[PDB]
Amino acid sequence: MNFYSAYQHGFVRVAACTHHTTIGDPAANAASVLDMARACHDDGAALAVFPELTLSGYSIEDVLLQDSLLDAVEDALLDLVTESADLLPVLVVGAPLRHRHRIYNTAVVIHRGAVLGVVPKSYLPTYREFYERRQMAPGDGERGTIRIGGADVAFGTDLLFAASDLPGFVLHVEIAEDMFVPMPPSAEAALAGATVLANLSGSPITIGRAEDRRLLARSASARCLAAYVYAAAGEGESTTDLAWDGQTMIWENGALLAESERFPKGVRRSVADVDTELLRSERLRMGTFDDNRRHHRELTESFRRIDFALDPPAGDIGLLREVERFPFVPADPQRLQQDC
Amino acid sequence: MNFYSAYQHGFVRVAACTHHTTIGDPAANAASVLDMARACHDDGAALAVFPELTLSGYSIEDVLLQDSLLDAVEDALLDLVTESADLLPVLVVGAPLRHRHRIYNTAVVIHRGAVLGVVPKSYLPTYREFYERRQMAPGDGERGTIRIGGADVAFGTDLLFAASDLPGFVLHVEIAEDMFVPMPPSAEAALAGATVLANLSGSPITIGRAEDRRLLARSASARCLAAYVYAAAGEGESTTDLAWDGQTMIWENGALLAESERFPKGVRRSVADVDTELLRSERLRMGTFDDNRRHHRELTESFRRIDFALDPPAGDIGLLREVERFPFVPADPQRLQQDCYEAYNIQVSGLEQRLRALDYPKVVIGVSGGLDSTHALIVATHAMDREGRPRSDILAFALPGFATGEHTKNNAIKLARALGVTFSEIDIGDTARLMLHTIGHVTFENVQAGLRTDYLFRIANQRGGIVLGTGDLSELALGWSTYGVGDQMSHYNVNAGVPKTLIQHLIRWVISAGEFGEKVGEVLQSVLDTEITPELIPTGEEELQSSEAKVGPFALQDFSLFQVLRYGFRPSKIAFLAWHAWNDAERGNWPPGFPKSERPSYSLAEIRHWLQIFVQRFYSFSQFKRSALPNGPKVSHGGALSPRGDWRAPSDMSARIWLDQIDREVPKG
Amino acid sequence: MNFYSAYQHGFVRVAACTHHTTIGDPAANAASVLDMARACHDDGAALAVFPELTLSGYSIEDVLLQDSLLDAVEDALLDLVTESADLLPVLVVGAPLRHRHRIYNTAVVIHRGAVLGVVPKSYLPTYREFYERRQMAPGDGERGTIRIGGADVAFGTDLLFAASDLPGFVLHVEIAEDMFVPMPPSAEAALAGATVLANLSGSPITIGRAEDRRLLARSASARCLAAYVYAAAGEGESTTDLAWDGQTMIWENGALLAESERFPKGVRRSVADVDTELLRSERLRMGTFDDNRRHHRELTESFRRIDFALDPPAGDIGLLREVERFPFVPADPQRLQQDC
Ligand SMILES: Nc1ncnc2c1ncn2[C@@H]1O[C@H](COS(=O)(=O)NC(=O)c2cccnc2)[C@@H](O)[C@H]1O
Ligand SMILES: Nc1ncnc2c1ncn2[C@@H]1O[C@H](COS(=O)(=O)NC(=O)c2cccnc2)[C@@H](O)[C@H]1O
Ligand SMILES: NC(=O)CC[C@H](N)C(=O)O
Ligand SMILES: NC(=O)CC[C@H](N)C(=O)O
Ligand SMILES: NC(=O)CC[C@H](N)C(=O)O
Ligand SMILES: [Cl-]
């Protein structure tokens, strides 16, 4: 084996991307997404998560209901897919999509020129600064397929994207408010076998909301013994009534793997190497995890596995991870004081 | 109603106890438990939670399978039950109980001489330092009844213990490892209507396990929008292979209400007052909570409600809760710095975007030298900076009409000239003097305000810019504006999100950060000192203190505003909260930057008076001014007052019921 | 028998009331409602329907979320119930009520000093001029009980209020948006045995909305072979962004029995005599009606019957109904032209 290949030791490179929203301009959002994704490709990442409703902008309210906007989103999405034929990572791109009667707040999971699936937001907030049920429809319980670019692809809150050559890498996709409810789609999905939990979030920034973002993302990564990839909306979202900080972060089992500048000027990424084997092991030893899955067997066998072959770079790409010299002696002095 | 009864204001007193374990002596554990329970009784608490396997000791391994031990456990449990007849709170005591084939790791829910229920542990950990499936049986899916002292009582992971006279108090009980799995029993129960989530925990202490306890407990309280009561095992558990820290804590909606000394010598309690109304309200407003419950309807209707009449003490028993004086301004210096950073950045960034949209116009602002205009100017400057735009596109304007001359206009000129903006002065007096005469002349102050805004708009038309307003959230709340043609109107209001109690500390933050000049800093501190100090002899009757004279002190009105906007609390509840926060200046904390000469103490009389003014001006008068409100970014978590955002309300509505409630419930003094 | 008693010939007198909303003042709404109900009592009515969110005002938006308002609503509701002990008609009063987590948009069905039931609105509109899912929760699928004034009363979209002494009088209650969806609760209810269909409506008035109100109400009364009672909100509702005409109307099997002045100055009623026997007979002969009920047997047996004794006046109280001299020859000249 190539001893210096991070992937061949169980690692998987993941990126949480915040892009340049151009509210109402889907082609201009897809341009920014394509550029950041090509960067992720150069970095050798396998996964790249963008913010909620990437292709249209989260803040555009009833402009979501205009046929020209929806059509431009579909065209930009098909453009993205076709460009993804030369891209290593799995792209997770937000979009307002047309299904049956309404438009759903979806994440399109795109890979190697194809749409693996389309996940709808499950819990649409309609309170305080949020008015989401006006324009969009909940997906909780929506299964089946959706037709996107002359193809029937998987659609629903019950998906898992398992890498056929990386048995540790199983991706699940929720959206914003999803992880804030007492029983988030991601927890069920984790019991069902999900190891990397992605979250696209629009998230207008507010005093203390970054603290909540971190609390819940970290606790999810801890409880679900998984990696959590978070990406929020940044510069470009309509400042009619809200502001946007563009926070991105990558958690692993309660441990902050990476995060980006808040309130940036320009796009940002958080790229890290997730040790899938560490999760595999924490789960092999914590029987009560499997015990919990079994207690909810019906909820957890109803997930659909979408198989894809990632084929990662097999050479030296470093290790974007802080391996401490002293596993028993933390190098941060305040933590070492508490430990002692 | 008794105004001073924490219970009659929706509070419930709860206890998380760590006791003196005496491994293998159920009588000695029942003794420690009865003593601590009698303490909680004297404190007026309604709930007291003890650690895992209380009556036997969590660490006694295969001694759990000895019949003499189990029998002594049953005897001590029956003793405890009988004694609980004269005990106010609901006791939640751990014990290994006999059911069908095996012994289950149970929490016995005891109250007023009867066993309300028996909740088994759901996920027995068998890994690393834990060997629980050896001695005991999982309870996930066990329903039915269990026979305890000649009575068939509910048994299962599906119970709820709801107070028939305290509807906000609905108890669910899980045990240790239960809260550590992807789908804890407590989440389901919360959806099913649980408001107080109890955890009995043995929890051998280890490097960083208190961190995990805190992480998951706080996360539970936040996600489940509930109170979380945690109690771990302490002195007396066999240190054959483990150590025990006896941590107890009480969380509420992600916020630590109380915790006790780790590794104590002797028993400990954490006693706090949980605001059930706060939970009730958070759940009233987060539709997605009920959305989630409905999505899991089968799981959430399968719960069994066991009804009990608590009958709590109706007198004054104080309030074991730290109510901060400034809901918008945290008294912790680290948190206040973080808050101020975030607020300042969202203001700057929202203006940055508005400007990029309009191909970078000029920025017209009338600067009077008060706090709101000063801060708006600073923000506009920083926005123009980060977008790489000449500061001379900022057009400050002092428009005086009837002021003879004052230090504040000098503040304005000095700050503007130190920043390097484009400053000009324009005396509106003549236009007002003409205008007044034309309409055949209170009215003249209205005319001046109108003319300031008119002139700024026409100058923005002339030089191709946008008027940037300076109205803050407190002025919007109370209607301290001139609507229409007046200081209310602008093209983009950067200060709309920010309350007036936070503007001062935003300016202090800008000073201490010192990103601008030292000269800018000095003039800003001048602005602060000038405006926050009352004028010896009133300077012409216009400054911040004038608004305070008409609408009450903002320290009190921002408190009322936070309560109303976030929780919809009734007036009497606001008066109770503010009276506990403010009536004693020596008690509680103060934020940084308050010289001890500016630390007041308000009376019930004053709180009641300004609350009358507040409900009258917020529910009724001022709404029509917010209804047509320029753009601007929401700042605090407490909400904003945009009609397109956090406050949808009618313009033609009376405040009669709120005034009537203040009259019926809040004492005159 | 007393030959001149309309009740003894199968009739039942029903009223659709629009009252004087006093937005934010529940006690004053209860005052207006009590006065109109007392009128309905004098008129010998068995049923009196008031508009959506009667006790609080429909248009008060986030003021529904203030604890003082909800508490005054509870107090006024209990006063109403106690006063209804001396009132003949069944009162159907709108109100925002507290249950489990949220407040539901409910109609309290009150009779002779007790609450027979509490029906929640089923479909909360969140589009155009409507923002209801913000403040209130859907009732579709909510069963069980609700606690109101120290009593557990039936709660849900599955109630029926059957008069034990007037078997032709079986009441069902839906609310506004309920009757505009492809499958309205009232249709199930009618198959289930409901003969008088009540609808509480707030209904901000608009060019052409009264036409739609009539279209759907009349179409309901015809398809369901039942009587339809409609009552909309009038003077007092916040004109911040909407206007209110206070239309009330009573339909029976496609035929307008009564209606009231639009945009009135002052409260209004529509009082009419419903020929329950005409409904009984149309249903006896239309086999396909019962056939439709059988095809939906599970949906239709799940309704709960709350029985109550109306005890109507047995004397001469006139007949509030236009009996045409020539059933074969309509007296309206235009209709007679069409008929010929
Ligand atoms: N001399 C000045 N030069 C330049 N700009 C000035 C000057 N005076 C005011 N402004 C401007 O009006 C904004 C706030 O007005 S105020 O003074 O706090 N209160 C009122 O107008 C008021 C209060 C109650 C009812 N109606 C009106 C300030 O931010 C500033 O932009
Ligand atoms: N609900 C409404 N909807 C629409 N228009 C309304 C409404 N209520 C009043 N008005 C009118 O608008 C003017 C507002 O005056 S103001 O410049 O904002 N200042 C003051 O009212 C003021 C008064 C007393 C003490 N301090 C300040 C009012 O005089 C009135 O004519
Ligand atoms: N990230 C989000 O979706 C923000 C909304 C959420 N209720 C919160 O306050 O954190
Ligand atoms: N209670 C905790 O330890 C929470 C820590 C978490 N990382 C946060 O910032 O919220
Ligand atoms: N208030 C409502 O629920 C909406 C009623 C309105 N008449 C409509 O047709 O939608
Ligand atoms: Cl202005």
Pocket test for ligand 2, best of B442, B446, B475, B483 (most atoms within 8 A of CB): B483
What SS3 class is residue C134?
helix
Q: How far is CA B2 from the centre of its chain?
A: 25
Element (H, E) at B221: helix B209-223
Shortest-distance Cα residue to atom 13 of ligand 1: B487
Instruction: State how far residue C188 is from chain A, nearest Cα, in angstroms.
Output: 23
- Phi/psi for B358 (5° steps) reads -90, 35
- Dihedral of alpha carbons C119, C123, C128, C133, sign: positive
Q: Which amino acid is at B322?
A: E
Is B568's Cβ below 8 Å from some Cβ in A? no
Nearest to B571 among C68, C134, C239 (CB): C68
Pocket test for ligand 5, best of C104, C127, C203, C213 (most atoms within 8 A of CB): C203
User: Is the CB of residue B478 less than 8 Å from the CB of residue B455?
Assistant: no
Q: Closest Cα to residue B10, out of B574, B565, B559, B558?
A: B574
Residue position matching structure tokens 């963008």: A50
Residue ranges of alpha helices (H) inside chain C are 26-42, 67-83, 132-135, 185-191, 209-223, 276-285, 287-295, 297-301, 333-339
Is C131's Cβ below 8 Å from some Cβ in A? yes
Termini Cα distance of chain C: 40
Residue A126 with chain C: CB contacts under 8 Å: 126, 133-134
Q: How far is CA C52 from the centre of its chain?
A: 9
CA B557 – CA B325 distance, rounded (Å)? 11
Residue A50 is encoded by which pair of tokens? 């963008």
Residue C106 is encoded by which pair of tokens? 């409910």
CA-CA-CA-CA dihedral for C315, C320, C326, C329, to nearest 10? -170
- Phi/psi for B217 (5° steps) reads -65, -45
Cα distances (angstroms) measured from residue C240 to each of B435, B479, B643, C23 = 31, 17, 11, 12
Specify which residues A163 forms β-bridges with.
Answer: A308
Residue A134 with chain C: CB contacts under 8 Å: 126-127, 131
Count of beta carbons in the 10 Å neighbourhood of residue B40: 24
Element (H, E) at C120: strand C114-120
Is A323's Cβ below 8 Å from some Cβ in B? no
Count of beta carbons in the 10 Å neighbourhood of residue A230: 29
Is B653's Cβ below 8 Å from some Cβ in C? yes
Does A125 sit within 8 Å of B287, measured CB to CB?
yes
No. of H helices and E strands in chain B? Answer: 22, 22
Instruction: State how far residue B332 is from chain C, nearest Cα, in angstroms.
Output: 30
User: Is the CB of residue B190 less than 8 Å from the CB of residue B122?
Assistant: no
Specify which residues B205 forms β-bridges with.
Answer: B243
Nearest to C65 among B289, B568, B573 (CB): B568
Instruction: State how far residue A238 is from chain C, nearest Cα, in angstroms.
Output: 21
Residue B337 with chain A: CB contacts under 8 Å: none
Element (H, E) at B18: strand B11-18
User: Is the CB of residue A251 less than 8 Å from the CB of residue A228?
Assistant: yes
**Which ligand is the nearest neighbour of the Cα of B542?**
1
Q: Closest Cα to residue A282, out of A198, A218, A217, A224?
A: A224
Q: Which long-range contacts (CB under 8 A, 24 or more apart) does C213-217 make?
A: C213/C247, C213/C249, C214/C249, C214/C256, C216/C179, C216/C180, C217/C179, C217/C249, C217/C251
Beta strands in B84-124 (DSSP E): 90-99, 102-111, 114-120
Q: Which residues contact A113 (CB under 8 A, 6 or more apart)?
A: A81, A82, A84, A85
Residue position matching structure tokens 């933390």: A330
CA C134 – CA C60 distance, rounded (Å)? 12
User: Is the CB of residue C56 less than 8 Å from the CB of residue C29?
Assistant: yes
Residue C288 is encoded by which pair of tokens? 């396909």
* Structure determined via: X-ray
SS (H, E, C) chain A: CCCCCCHHHCEEEEEEEECCCCCCCHHHHHHHHHHHHHHHHHCCCCEEECCCCCCCCCCCHHHHHCHHHHHHHHHHHHHHHHHHHHCCCEEEEEEEEEECCEEEEEEEEEECCEEEEEEECCCCCCCCCCCHHHHCECCCCCCCEEECCCCEEEECCCEEEEECCCCCCEEEEEEHHHHHCCCCHHHHHHHCCCCEEEEECCCCECCCHHHHHHHHHHHHHHHCCCEEEEECCCCCCCCCCCECCCCEEEEECCEEEEECCCCCCCCEEEEEEEEHHHHHHHHHHCHHHHHHHHHCHHHHHCCEEEEECCCCCCCCCCCCCCCCCCCCCCCCHHHHHHHC
Residue position matching structure tokens 């649980």: B194
Residue C44 is encoded by which pair of tokens? 């010998």
CA B642 – CA B476 distance, rounded (Å)? 9
Q: Which amino acid is at C212?
A: D
Residue A243 with chain B: CB contacts under 8 Å: 345-347, 349-350, 633-634
Residue C134 with chain A: CB contacts under 8 Å: 126-127, 131
**Which ligand is the nearest neighbour of the Cα of C232?**
5
Q: Which residues contact B288 (CB under 8 A, 6 or more apart)?
A: A123, A124, A125, A127, A177, A180, A181
Resolution (Å) of this entry: 3.1
Q: Which residues contact B468 (CB under 8 A, 6 or more apart)?
A: B351, B363, B364, B365, B376, B380, B490, B491, B492, B493, B494
In order, the DSSP letters of B457-501 are: HHHHHHHTEEEEE---HHHHHHT-S--SSSTT--SEETTTT--HH
When computed from its CA atoms, the radius of gyration of chain C, rounded to whole angstroms, is 19
CA B123 – CA A223 distance, rounded (Å)? 14
Q: Closest Cα to residue B235, out of B462, B553, B17, B508?
A: B17
Instruction: State how far residue C335 is from chain B, nearest Cα, in angstroms.
Output: 46
Shortest-distance Cα residue to atom 22 of ligand 2: B482
Does B125 sit within 8 Å of A288, measured CB to CB?
yes
